[PDB]
Design a protein around this nucleic acid. Structure first.
Lengths: 88, 195, 48
DNA sequence: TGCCGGAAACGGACGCGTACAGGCCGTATAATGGGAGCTGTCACGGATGCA
DNA sequence: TGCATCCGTGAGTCGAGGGTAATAACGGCCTGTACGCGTCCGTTTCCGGCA
């Protein structure tokens, strides 16, 4: 929003906002790497017909990515419950 | 993303390995995302920043040893407190030294951890100062630490893209001349491999 | 084999332009590499 | 009998109103690292890793 | 430097022979595709008169 027709933002303000923007991505990747185990555990049982185990795993991580994009904390539910639906 | 042809990597003689002077096992590790490889390294920047990087390493080691002697003095204060609380009340002869032995063991494990960190920093610096192309960097953690501490002075990837870049930065004429010199001058196994 | 190659290439493209961690991206790249290897010569390396 | 010269349905292009075919999205307690099948040939050559 | 380990390759010839493991399932919508009578071109009988 503030890039076009905006203002010359202060150096400290701009660096802090860039830092939090980077930290959001860092946290997202951290959560993804942490929760790949749920994906593989859920995909362990869909093998044996058509697809390969690793292909099922990859589709599982795609579903987990969408799950973390759509996930929210304000409802007080565990992340696994919401992620299972998207992975499946 | 690029892929590598299976014929020239897996076979009786490994053609990619023979061309790049790489062992087939290392080549498999490289092109199967099991080990990083250094695509290229700079010489002038390393040469003229060696002094300042050594100074930075010395400063960091001085900070770590300052933390170490801070731990030593904290352990000394703890030992003084244990002496005050044990040599002033009624306790067993072994009981008044149990806490001393425990503190000694904690001090030993603290200095052992410090020695491990010192050795880790030493090997990181050694592999940075002896960096060269066509060198595999196992221990992804070590590679990541080396990258974040020394993002410049070199570039390194892993996989088919890295192999493609390695082939890109290759001089067939110089390689042929070097191999010709080796086949003229060397003897035995080196000459056979050169052939 | 061609279907596996195409599927893994497309999935790699989707992961790349979506933005994925290096672990997943490298795993998908290895998937594509192994699929191409199987297409060119099945059973040459690993389980056929 | 056959031919002439149009005349009767049986078929290519359809707005229209409807059928459905297929695709996308989204689901809230909790669940967090595989089954798995193999290894009864024999001679040859060669490349590789390690003592 | 020698030694073991491993990998890979080739090891017949002629008929007889053909179809398989493993689960959330719905709303809302939406755009696309189709396709069923009617009037046109056109081709197989029509039938009125006829030579």
């Amino acid at each position: 929003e503030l890039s076009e027709r905006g203002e010359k933002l202060p150096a400290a303000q701009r660096r802090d906002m860039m830092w939090i923007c980077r930290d959001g991505d860092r946290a997202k990747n951290h959560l993804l790497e942490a929760n790949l185990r749920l994906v593989v555990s859920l995909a362990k049982r869909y093998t044996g017909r058509g697809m390969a185990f690793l292909d099922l795993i990859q589709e599982g991580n795609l579903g987990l990515i969408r799950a973390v994009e759509k996930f929210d904390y304000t409802k007080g539910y565990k992340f696994s419950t919401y992620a299972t639906w998207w992975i499946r | 993303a690029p892929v590598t042809h299976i014929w020239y990597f897996k076979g009786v003689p490994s053609r990619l390995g023979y061309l790049l002077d790489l062992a087939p096992k290392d080549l498999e590790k490289i092109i199967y995302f099991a080990a990083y490889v250094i695509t290229s390294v700079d010489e002038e920047m390393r040469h003229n920043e060696l002094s300042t990087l050594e100074a930075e390493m010395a400063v960091e080691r001085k900070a770590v040893e300052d933390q170490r002697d801070g731990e030593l003095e904290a352990r000394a204060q703890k030992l003084e407190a244990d002496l005050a609380e044990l040599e002033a009340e009624g306790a067993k002869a072994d009981a008044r030294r149990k806490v001393r032995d425990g503190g000694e063991r904690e001090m030993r494990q603290i200095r052992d951890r410090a020695q491990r960190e010192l050795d880790r920093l030493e090997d990181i610096w050694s592999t940075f100062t002896k960096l060269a192309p066509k060198q595999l960097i196992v221990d992804e953690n070590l590679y990541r630490e080396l990258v974040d501490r020394y993002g410049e002075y070199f570039t390194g990837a892993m996989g088919a893209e890295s192999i493609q870049k390695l082939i890109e930065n290759f001089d067939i004429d110089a390689e042929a001349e070097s191999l010709r010199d080796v086949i003229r001058n060397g003897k035995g196994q080196k000459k056979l491999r050169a052939l | 084999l061609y279907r596996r190659v195409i599927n893994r290439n497309n999935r790699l493209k989707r992961l790349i332009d979506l933005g994925a961690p290096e672990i997943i991206v490298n795993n998908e790249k290895r998937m594509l590499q192994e699929s191409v290897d199987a297409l060119f010569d099945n059973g040459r390396r690993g389980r056929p």
